[model samples]
Each structure stands twice: as structure tokens, then as C-alpha cells.
Target: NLPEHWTDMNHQLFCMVQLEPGQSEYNTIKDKFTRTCSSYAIEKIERIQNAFLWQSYQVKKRQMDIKNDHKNNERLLFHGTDADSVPYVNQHGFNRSCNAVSYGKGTYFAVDASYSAKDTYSKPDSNGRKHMYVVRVLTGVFTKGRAGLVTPPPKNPHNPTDLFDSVTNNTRSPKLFVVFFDNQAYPEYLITFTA
Candidate 1:
């Protein structure tokens, strides 16, 4: 038997119900797609089941990563009575914009830092120095004025040198720049390499 109307959910139900060969009125092989039968349901349950499983597995893995990453804790809350700043700076010689965090729903990190590609390529500091954007991750506030290159770090357990190398070695701009205090363990700077 087939349901009178079809939706993705009900269609999935139909596929599950019509599991056995020659089970229901629906000819799984020949009933391509009808008003009450969905090919998508059959495709999901039979043809491409493994693909859906793998995609769900990947989604869970990413969720776990987000939960464990220190950067996840460094988000800005926007629902308080206090004022919320947009964190945009394009004055004088500096040009930067901080939007919401790329992931998460209605969530934003402390600062979404980005710089001007034109300034980076055309008016780069002669000494290879890069301006650091100071961000208060908890408050979503940021300011940019300090200038410095990626300083060298000593050989350590977490391989700070490798991380810095990966971030600064690339020519992509506007890049994420963060200056962390010595007391902090996880440097709270997320520089996405998209301009």
C-alpha cells in the first residue's frame, strides 16, 4: 500500500516498510518516482546507504572536535542588555572587518579578523612585518595598531614553530592575526585564509 501524499519523511517510511522483495504494491525497481513513492527514499536506504552513514559519521566527528577545541569556548554572546559592537575597523592606514564566526548558528567568535588584501600586497611593510589585530574573544571587541612579525618560538611539546610557520609562511590575505599574552595556554587567534 502507498500513502496518498508524499513527503521526504513519509517516503523514507515507505522505503523502510517495503523492505522485502515483492513486498508492497510499489515496485522498488520500476516505480522510479510517483506521487506517493519517492526514488530518493529507495536511493537512501539501498543504493547509497553507505554514503549517508559516512556523512553522518563525519558530522559527528566534526561536532566532537568543535566541543573539545578551546576556540569553541572563545565565543561572544550577543543577547545581553549591554551594547554589542560590530568590530569593524577601516580607518587611517588600517583596514579590517570582523563578522560572525564561519560555523555555528547565530554564534560569533570574539573577533572575526581580516585585513585589506590590497594593502597587504601593495603597501606591505618593507621589513616583512605584519600588523597584529588585538581581539577580546569573550566580548567580541577588537582593535588593530600593533605591528610585528611572527616571532620565533623555542622547541616545545606542542610544536609552536610548526603552527606559526603554517600561518605566516603563506601569502594569503587577509589573514588571521592574533597576539596572545604569555599567561595564556591556547593562543585564541583563528585566521581563516580567505579574503
Candidate 2:
């Protein structure tokens, strides 16, 4: 026990976790842990234990979707099942549930774009703070391969669109943010890089 004069609320957290699991379900988990742990370790361990349970559930759901892809034929897609007859494949085709980033249209996953760069994401702040990188969409390029930096602005962007005027122009790359890694949020966002 802490000294009588200490007046801290630490022990109370351990008591509460024992009473409830999450969402205020009192003393449920606490009752189990109390059967073995000291208050200090019990409080921290419960936090990790609860988080791992939730994480495991997310991984399990993704795996289940892949395992049942073929039987769930309607759930496999990429844009339109009839959209160009390139034909589509199931999540099992990719064989790695974790690669299925988009759950829309169906469990469509890429094969291997001979033209794409490696898959990646980066926030703008990571590239540099408070700025956007601008690039002009090239004349014939309509598709994106893995993840990559766009060709920077047209150098003399004033004749083009003003969107190209503000950011860093990496002509070595292509157009401003045809796809950019936002450093602040560290998420990949797509920009059409056209007029």
C-alpha cells in the first residue's frame, strides 16, 4: 500500500479495469486479473491486453475475407467486372490478405504493374513542412504504377495552370503531385495534375 499521505489515484485505475473491460463494463477484466496481479502491473498489462485483442480481430476479419473470396464471387472486382474485360481476380489471387488496401468494388488486388514503382506513402511534413509539390501530368500518361513522385511543374508553369505555380517542381520526377505523400498526415493523396 502507498503511504496514507500520498493521495494518488493510481490504484483506482487498476480497480476499474478489473471491474470492466471497455465501454464501462465494470469489474469484468479486473475480476480476472485480480485473481493474480498486483495493482501496478495489472493496470498497464490490461491496456496492452485489450489493445492486442482488438488488433487480432482486425487481422482475422481480413484473413476471413480472403479465404472465402472464390465462393463469394460477387465480392471480387476492380472498378467494373465488365469495365474493359481485363478480367479480375479474387483476393486469393493475390494470396496475401494484407495487400488488399481497397475494400471497395470487390476484393480486387493488383498483380504486378511492370511500370509501377514500389508501394509507399509519406506525409508532406516528412518531405518538408508547409508546402505542396506540384507537377504537370504528362501528355500521354493516364495511369499510375506503384507509388512515385510526379514530374515537377512544367518549369514555366504560368502558361499552364496556377496549381503548378506554388510547389516544388521536380522535373526529374514528372508533374506536381500526380500522387503526393503528405508529410504532415503521412498519407498518400492523388491529384490529377492536369489543367
Candidate 3:
């Protein structure tokens, strides 16, 4: 009754659909990714469809405290990860530990695919393919971060209660952003390619 190959024993929470040439979603990513990572040729693009995770993201949007834009402040970002991490992340969503957490104890997403494509982040697989994610991040309100910061700093210097939604290395022109909430991001696509 279900799609032939997607539902695993009828218990699977999500599935990946390979994006083909004519698909607008496929072309969109290919065009933007190639423009960003000219050094890496995109080999296979897969769209991650996870209903449960997306519902959770919607809940996160509704529950956000500071919605200056009132639009969930969502943006597409990148995260380089290991092949081993995909299955869990595809269904369960992102965790701070999955990322390096150098900027803080939060999941890091990059504005530049080039940064995520670096060998140190997206290590090559056995077939010489590297994995990176196009993530939808909710950057409601953010502030500059420092080393060893486990949580977002207080919004006001004097008041220690209200905290920022995310943290970044540079507030003026942030290249990296970190969020402690797992629901703050959705891994929309998995890109496999070579550098």
C-alpha cells in the first residue's frame, strides 16, 4: 500500500529521495552548490523528507520567545558530517555533539559551503565521496560567542534571564552559527560529492 522502497517495515520515520536532472529542487541545489563549491563537483543530491522532524521544527517555531521578524527567522545553511551520522540525524534531528562545537556546545551551521566542504569537516568516504547537509536553521535572535560557551549568553548585560537564540563568531558578518536547541535545524538535503 505504501511506496515500494521507502517505507522500511512500515516503521520508518523518514526517507531520502534522489533528486534528478529535471526536478526543480535538484536543479536549485545543484546550481547554488556548484556556484559555492566550484572545487567540488556535486555527484548525488538527496532530499530528506522527515515528517516527524519537520513537525517538531514547526513546534520550535511556534515556541520561539523572540520573533522579531515573526517569520521564524529561518535560513538555509550547511553542515559537514560523517556518513555514519546520517541515518540517526535523518530521523532524530541534529544534536550539538554531532558537530565539532568549537564555537560553543551547540550545533554549528555554515553560511559558506566551502567551509563545510573542507576535508577536516566532511571527510572522504570509502568511495571518495564527502557528505554535507543543507540545513534550515532558525536564527531568531543571535549574539557573538566565545570559547567554552555551553549556552547562549544573556540578551542584556545586566539581566541574566533572557538569552539569545543562537551564537556566532562574528555578529557583523557571521560565517558560523551555533544553536543549542536540537529542533532549531532540519537537514533538508544531503550532498555527496568529491573535492
Candidate 4:
């Protein structure tokens, strides 16, 4: 039996796992954990639980896709179906589901880049956080095995496009890249420099 001092309303999460005998849901949350006191807290917990469920579905979907590719002896250059293609590139030439990252077009950029990029949402959330959902490609002479026109001065600067008056030139990398349309994504290229 739960303690009398326990909160008026408690929240618990259940995990339904796939099993040979049949699926069963287990109360995964701790009985002592009584954080869902207010409507806001309950709503937050529900949202998080929903996210977990969605993520699980996506994982299974990916596994099936990969399995089918192998069954057909398909030379899967990358991951995901055509749905994962980024807007800017040819769908046939590149694949966003490169098994490097999970979700959203499948291609994985550097975690550092994800953390460094500014949020793209127009308004901040209740926690004073903006969403970072943009993707941009940057490359130059320093880049390898690619060819793109290098322009003077970054075409788009976060603040004051002309902020770098002394820096008269900017360059672009020709590497096959993929990013979200928001202009916040960065690439972790597959090139190695030689001395």
C-alpha cells in the first residue's frame, strides 16, 4: 500500500514491450515519484511519454526498412526511403538516412553543430528556449573532394550581413550536403586533410 502522506494524485508510466507470448504493459514509473501535481506537470509528463512512444515506433520502422533492403540485396547507399531527402539536393544522388543520426531525414550532422546553431523558432517557449531546426552547408578550399562556387562574404550572416567589412570574401564547399530548410544545420563532413 502507498503511504498516506503521498500526493493527492500520482502519475505513472507503463511500457508495453513486444514478447512472444503477447505484449504486456508494465508500470515503469516509480511509485514514490510524485511529481505530477498540477495540470502543467501532468501535461509535461504526457508529452514526454508521447515522445518516447513515437521514438520507439520510428526505431522499429527503421529496422524493418533496413531488413527489407538486405533481403532484396539492395545496395543501400544510405538509409531511409525517398521521404528523407533534403530539399536542396537530388534525391537519387544523396541519402539523408545515412545511419549516422536518427530521425528527420536520417542524415546525422555533428552533435556540436546541433548544439551550436541558434534556434529558428520565431518565439521562445515557456522555458525561454527557441527551437533550433534549421540546416546550412559551409565549405571552402579547405574542404576536400568537392567543387562549389566560392562567394566573397558569407551570403547570409546571422547579424548584419556586412558585419565583416574587412573580410571581403567567403567560400562554399561542394561536398554533397544535406540540411533542414531553416538554415541552422551544419555538416560533419567526411574529409580528411593531409599535411
Candidate 5:
């Protein structure tokens, strides 16, 4: 079998398509958003079209799925990011340049929208608008996270070759998850709103 690849979908770079009210992508983004945090009013939903980065993400997602024996435990998660950085995340994907103390040194995401929306996580823009990302994340064999982890610890510390796919605060249920790889996730939708 040829298997699957990202290029199969034919994507373009620096792409963002505004989704309308009736579209499935738009509806899903809106539905979960309101369910998670209905305090804010959604102004717009834009689907990211960073084809190159998406292809990279597709590859990594398969790696995670295969490791998990075809479970394909992909999830949609939210991140409260400042408006200033939305453009970068919209096109280039998540960057690990940002540092954090709560979990570990990796790109972080919130399980709930409200957490990121408040606590100075989602910064307002000049016009008093806040932004968040609905991202596709893969959680494969994640371990409990701790501070000062530049990368996930080796699964078998003695071997030192194999490492966990991601990190989180809890194994069963968590408020947050972190991934060290830039391609392990994709910014699927951007929801602009005001609270």
C-alpha cells in the first residue's frame, strides 16, 4: 500500500480560510467553544491552511498512531494565546520558544477554554479582542510532567533511546498537555472573540 501523505490533500502555504456559520468546521469550532466557555461571543472562525506544516503534522500523527497500535488518539484542544502571536501560529504552527514553569519547557495547551481565556493567558488586542486556537493534538504515551524538562524523559531511563511522545500533569485526566515537537500538532481553527 502507498499509505497516506499530507500532499494528497493539495494545500497552499500562508493560508487561512474564513469559515461561515453553516459549514461543518465552523459549527464544530463554535459548538465546542460555547460549551467550554460561553462567556465570550465569537466574532469569527478561520481555518488555517499552512499546507507544509500540516503535512509535517500528518506524518507525526501517523507515527503516534502506529506506536499506539492504530488507536489514533488524536484530540482537539484549545490554547489561549495572545493576539499578537496568532498570525505566527496560524501559519507556522506552534513554536517551543515560549517557556513555562507549570508543566515543562514545551508548547502548552489548555483542556478547557476558560483557563486559557483568563489568567492573563489570552491577551486582549488594541481593540479589546481576544484570540484562541483550536488545535489537533496527538497524545501518545505521555508521562506526568515536571519542571526543568527540556525534553520528555526516556520511557526506560536505563535505555535512554526511546522517549515519551508528550507530557502532561496527569495520566488519567489532565488540565493541560505539552508537546516538544513543533509538528506534533496543528492549528485547525482560530476563534476571534471579545469577552
Candidate 6:
């Protein structure tokens, strides 16, 4: 039965609800967006959903790659941290901006080293070379310099030529760049790429 104050809009909704909400049921559709209803909730949802986001997902699972790849490779970190290697952070003491990472052009990565610490990396232009930036985000600490890019591996199991090909036989020019970071507080590695 319709309510005494039912209006055209109310009648329409009532009919829709009575019809089982259909394939396009708002209740089901809204369930997916429930995470966006709050910041804390959205953070949790993104933490899980980012497992598949190709672009800029959460920095957890990727941390493993960062720790393993950059733990000792400083050149790669340098390449990615340098403003010329990346194009996101403009030249001018970018390494001190934040603790983050990036790949080729605009791909960005942020190291969740701690609740009050982070490492950022991005590409910026300068000095006749493709540029990138490595920013250190800390509460009150100081950073010595920008990190380097990943160096050649002794024997890469994933791709036998990843090390050599990365330096030589360049297909996309200097578009390929990788970045990594270690988050002590969160205990995760932040890894990302660009091309």
C-alpha cells in the first residue's frame, strides 16, 4: 500500500524495491561503494582492492619486490631518484621533498617506511638528461642524497637478459626506469615502474 504522502518519486522507488531490485539493484551496486563512505573504510578497501590495480595501488605486496630488488642495488635507485631519470618531480633538491619512487615517465611510488617517514620518486627535467626525483618524507630527519636505479643482477631468474637488456639493446629508449623503497615501521617494500 502507498503511504498517505507518497509522491511520484516515492511511488517509483516503492515499485522498484518491490520488484526484487532487478539486475541493476541499487542495494547490490551500492555495496561496492560502501567503502567510499568513510576514510578509514576506504583505506581498508583500497588495501585489499589494490592487489590488482595496475597503476598506483597500495604499497604492500609491491614492497616485497622493492626490498628484494633494491636492498643492494643502488644504481637503479639512483636512476629512478635522479630528476633526469624521471619526469614527475622538477629539479631543485627533489630528493628531500618526500620518500617516494617512480618508473619511466609519470609512474610514481611512495615508500611507507614508517608512520612519519616516507620516500618518494618521480621524473623531472634538467641538465640535458631525462630527469627523476627522489623525495624523502620524514618528520624531522635529513637525507644524504637521492637513491639510484636498479643495477644489473648477477643472474636474473625471471628474465636472463633483464640486467643486460636494461642497460643495452634499449627498445623504448630511456623510458624504462624502476624504483624501490623500504618502510621500516610498516615493514613493506614499495616498488614501481615507468616507461
Screening candidate 5 with a backbone cut-off below 3 angstroms (N, C-alpha, C), the clashing residue pairs are: none
The predicted structure with the larger lDDT, 1 or 2, is: 1
Instruction: Write the residue-wise lDDT of candidate 1 on 160-192 in tens digits.
Output: 542211111122331333322221111111111
Q: How would you encode candidate 4's per-residue C-alpha lDDT over 1-195 as one tens digit per residue?
A: 322322233354322112121112112221111122111121111101222333343453344346444322111111111212222222122233333222223232322222212233112344543221122222111112112222223324654332111110112522122232221122111110110
Model 2 per-residue lDDT tens digits across residues 95-140 = 1121222211112211111111112211123322111111111112
Question: Which 10-residue window in model 6 sums to the lowest lDDT?
Answer: 42-51
Preferred candidate (TM-score higher): 2 or 6: 6
1-195: candidate 3 lDDT, tens digit per residue: 332433353566667888787677788887767767987878888878787887788788777733454674788899887778878888887887653566788888889998999888888988888999999898778898887888899998798977888998899999999998878898888999997
**What is each predicted model's overall lDDT from 0 to 1?**
0.24, 0.22, 0.82, 0.23, 0.80, 0.25
Question: For each candidate, what TM-score against the reference?
Answer: 0.15, 0.15, 0.87, 0.20, 0.89, 0.17
Instruction: Give per-residue lDDT, candidate 3, residue 4.
Output: 40
Candidate 3 or 4, higher lDDT? 3
Between prediction 4 and prediction 6, which has the larger TM-score? 4
List residue ranges in candidate 2 displaced over 4 A: 1-26, 38-59, 65-195
Candidate with maximal lDDT = 3
Quick one: RMSD of model 4?
19.5
Instruction: Report model 2's TM-score to 2 decimal places.
Output: 0.15
Estimate, for each residue in 110-171, the C-alpha lDDT of model 6 and write its tens digit.
Answer: 22212111123223223322222122221111111223434333234676543321222122
Best by TM-score: 5
Candidate 2 lDDT score at position 125: 31
- Where model 5 places Cα greater than 4 Å from the true spot, the runs are 1-11
